[PDB]
């Protein structure tokens, strides 16, 4: 059998606060199941250090869910409680295969829509600039399909290397730190003032492939979602 993400300790703070949604939305494993060596393809421990996700076919997804810790249900948390809400994430994003063209790997996400994506992207232009091979962020700043309800920016081209991440929520205010450098700095998330389900995802959602059969693959060395 492949190695269970759960056979080391690096990743049993976050899997004792996650559920798995693979290969949709519903539910593949229970926190206690990815604590106790759940384990497949989609799901497993690569190289002796990384939580590795794969997934193939459009809006297929292998994601974690956050959820209460220590075996409770799903959390729900509001953008301006006072604390800080943060994901603190080590990446590794490889060469993607053809065929996939943008590979959601960390969420804020709520009841009815996703507060932010960080995503790598083959190829796209942002605000009349062509990027290639990079990380991007989408923030909903509205409900609606028009661009005025979207803040896209570029956080990196991709590496090699793992790439750290960084997501801080406190008082309506989004910032972002890649690799130790801010680089979305107080985004304002006060349209989501009210709301009281949002939680944090990572993993693998791969949107818009070319191909239903191409498989995104997403490495992550480090994962913690805490409220300080």
């Not at 297929?60 to 220590?70: T, V």
């Not at 700043?141 to 803040?151: A, E, L, M």
């Amino acid at each position: 059998f492949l190695t269970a993400v759960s056979s080391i300790d690096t990743f049993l703070p976050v899997l004792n606060e996650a559920k798995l949604q693979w290969p949709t939305s519903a539910l593949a494993a229970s926190s206690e199941e990815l604590l106790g060596g759940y384990v497949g393809s989609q799901f497993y421990l690569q190289d002796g250090k990384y939580m590795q996700f794969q997934i193939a076919g459009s809006s297929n997804r292998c994601e974690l869910r956050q959820m209460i810790p220590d075996g409770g249900s799903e959390i729900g948390w509001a953008v301006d409680d006072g604390t800080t809400h943060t994901a603190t994430s080590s990446i590794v994003v490889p060469e993607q295969v053809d065929g996939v063209e943008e590979v959601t790997i960390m969420q804020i996400h709520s009841g009815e829509a996703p507060q932010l994506r960080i995503s790598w992207i083959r190829s796209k232009s942002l605000d009349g600039v062509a990027y290639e091979d990079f990380i991007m962020s989408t923030v909903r700043i509205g409900t609606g399909d028009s661009s005025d309800n979207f803040v896209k920016t570029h956080l990196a081209d991709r590496t090699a290397g793992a790439m750290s991440f960084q997501i801080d929520v406190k008082d309506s205010k989004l910032t972002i730190t890649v690799n130790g450098n801010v680089v979305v700095n107080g985004q304002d998330l006060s349209f989501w003032d009210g709301t009281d389900s949002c939680y944090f995802k990572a993993g693998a959602f791969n949107n818009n492939p070319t191909s239903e059969s191409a498989t995104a693959r997403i490495k992550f060395a480090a994962l913690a979602w805490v409220d300080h």
